[PDB]
Symmetry: C3
Subunit: 335 residues, 3 copies
């Protein structure tokens, strides 16, 4: 009986960070309380000033990552403030019944609701808005995130050996369908509702105009690059709520990867490129061995470099000549 | 010697049902006899009244599912009635040699042929028409289905434990390429051959006009929804002969999934969304824990909700408040 | 210390062949020396006479397959001849650091460089050119190939039983983006640079004009078909540096498949169709049981038969009636 379990509130943090949590824990099942607030906003998505009429959990794309342990209950209050124009709900892929909770969380602007569900399966799971009659529009406008359900004893390799990360990062990849006018330029809409019909038309062609990590071209670059050091293990959580992606770390690997995202299954090792099915989240472990600026990207290189599905990881530390060495620098072809 | 083995005739049933069969059997290898008849027919594929000049096994999309056990021989009589326009054949992915049997089953209208092959590998396999020079057209027009080859001792989890289902369902997903006229309306053809050049032109764009389960938009909805109850285990067989898909059960999971469809390989557990490669069939087991109407869909949500790749499962039984509970119904935000 | 290890030179061979190598070896780690030369060239890619302003490793698409053993070092000299227009480099997915080696191998026309890296992870790995600001263009123009890093003890099934092949074949699949003029005909460029802006425009649509094995429509057909015999085991290495593919052997199977291409992971068996993620190479074993001409293809059948992603394997030997038999040849339906 979940009603008689300990109840704890967790404060969420903005992507690419994940809120503080234990991996292995000695503690028993708890009801973990989260709150999220829908924010509809116009967002600049590229270095030309192209805007999206966006819909977000907590003002960000992706929504924040919620972390519990297997056997815990997730208890979410979803707030849809009167400042919004559309109704919303939430469908958790980690939950069982009522369309993921969508049937029980239909909130019109000015309303809120509270859902509890048992997180009885370990893994990274997508959550997204799913209002009947307009599911794809709400999802592609930015309403998705990840729930991570860790095993109580933490992550394990195929032989049951413990795997540990020093930092988790969360990347949400968003296929965007921005309409154009007769002049060939991207439309700019005064309101969210004005964007609807044209956006649906672009959606039906199945060709995204942009594909971005975390809400914009270059979101995870420059001052906002991910960071690490040699010897550090990172967990990279990657969600795509609508479309397939194929993550790749340039100069690195996926040491252990759950590409389907489910921790009771044995991970795969040494992956160059992995595969996140549209409507899922996956996770990769990597321990950095070389310093430098890595690219983390969708390995359809057109989608990465032309459409925006790429970020950076800046890594400090000592170069290893055993792993890689320049034997002869670029120089004239000998006579 | 396959000639001296027992012979049995099996009567096929229309999708989404699968003909009665044993899972684990004490029986030895048999030659199992099936007959199918190719039916070319004009089919209404959506609610606007759009038609496809279709090609079907037994008048349905997908063709019926054929079930045998590993070690059995499949003996199919393929009939191409005098009233059809085109030559046809059959290519079984479960078979070895002669292009899956296509080379041995070249039937013009007014002809029939009988092929035997050994089903020596367990799994769900695509079969489809493959007439020389005309393969993609015949496949996308509806000519595919599934052969399920069960292990003699039935399905097993990764640790060798027996897995039973109470009901198998078969879903065939079809990417359609319907031409449009200068007015931007879908073309309606008097004959199959009239539709050919225009369809190839759409196919080459690699963008489907429609993507449907079992022959039309909403085919597995309303009175034709799949049904189950709480406590029942269903096997969901999903085929896609031409294009990738990513099945998802909203409010449910894949308890045990063979996404590549081959039963000698350990399945994966707890999947939110799985992946069927174009040119293959996969299988998922799920045991229902909550009542209600579920959606079963391709989790590219545009393909599901805009293009038609979605169905329903109507489930009876008792709601489980432990697995999911509405703690606070949608209500005003406290001022 | 890698500098003190034995050094050997390897002579590469043109695809679809792979240079002579041991599977299991008693040899210890070695620095294995290769040299490749970038060749920019206009290439005829289809029957209609359509050309590509192509960029190639050693004049071929794909580049040749480099084969080492786990724990070896790869030492590549990359030559960019004085007669080329563009700067180049190489990114090995099998390497660790400096963007797969791309940062250390920036060669302008007239220059060369030598890179060493430890091949410490077994599997088939993509390598490709990756010049700053120009990555997708160079890759889709033909600059990719495979590095195969074999385990020292050769290939193993999931139970650890040895798996041996008689011949390895290497297939590179290339999605091409050829611009058209206002007349709807494919453009023919005098220079590589003239093709640039137009190609980027086609790339952004994400719709290939052609998808080819090994550099052109029908490259592995006719006199250039792959060959084999009944009882022979082949390894089929399949690489795709930019886009997903789904390999299928018509009338055959993947007996043991590493679809993510990493040999430390258990392979899967009996696959009808497998999946190569864009940005990876995979590998499949098959032992032939039937004679005949097989088709090896991308099982998006439009991409195979309309766009070019198909080849042939011609197989000699004795027909096996136990596996497949024509019981009744095509004949009039009985009246
Ligand atoms: Cl030929
Ligand atoms: Cu919403
Ligand atoms: Cu969903
Ligand atoms: Cu046909
Ligand atoms: Cu096929
Ligand atoms: Cu280059
Ligand atoms: Cu790469």
């Amino acid at each position: 009986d979940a009603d008689k379990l300990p109840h704890t509130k967790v404060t969420l943090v903005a992507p690419p960070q994940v809120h503080p949590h234990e991996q292995a824990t000695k503690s028993g099942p708890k009801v973990v309380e989260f709150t999220m607030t829908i924010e509809e906003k116009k967002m600049v998505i590229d270095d030309k000033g192209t805007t999206l009429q966006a819909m977000t959990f907590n003002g960000s794309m992706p929504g924040p990552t919620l972390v519990v342990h297997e056997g815990d209950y997730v208890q979410l209050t979803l707030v849809n403030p009167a400042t919004n124009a559309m109704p919303h709900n939430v469908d958790f892929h980690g939950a069982t019944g009522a369309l993921g909770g969508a049937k029980l969380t239909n909130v019109n602007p000015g309303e809120q609701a509270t859902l509890r569900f048992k997180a009885d399966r370990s893994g990274t799971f997508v959550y997204h808005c799913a209002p009947e009659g307009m599911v794809p529009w709400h999802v592609v406008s930015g309403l998705s995130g990840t729930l991570m359900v860790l095993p109580r004893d933490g992550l394990k390799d195929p032989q049951g050996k413990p795997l540990h990360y020093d930092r988790a990062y969360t990347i949400g990849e968003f296929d965007l369908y921005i309409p154009k006018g007769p002049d060939g330029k991207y439309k700019d809409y005064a309101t969210l509702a004005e964007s609807y019909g044209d956006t649906v038309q672009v959606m039906r062609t199945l060709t995204p105009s942009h594909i971005v990590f975390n809400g914009k071209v270059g979101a995870l670059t420059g001052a906002n690059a991910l960071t690490a050091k040699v010897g550090e293990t990172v967990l990279l959580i990657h969600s795509q709520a609508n479309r397939d992606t194929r993550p790749h770390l340039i100069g690195g690997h996926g040491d252990w990867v759950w590409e389907t995202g489910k921790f009771a299954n044995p991970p795969q090792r040494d992956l160059e490129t992995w595969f996140i099915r549209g409507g899922s989240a996956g996770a990769a472990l990597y321990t950095f061995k070389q310093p430098g600026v890595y690219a983390y990207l969708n390995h359809n290189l057109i989608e990465a470099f032309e459409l925006g599905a790429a970020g950076h990881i800046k890594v400090e530390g000592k170069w290893n000549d055993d792993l890689m060495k320049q034997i002869k620098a670029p120089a004239p072809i000998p006579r």
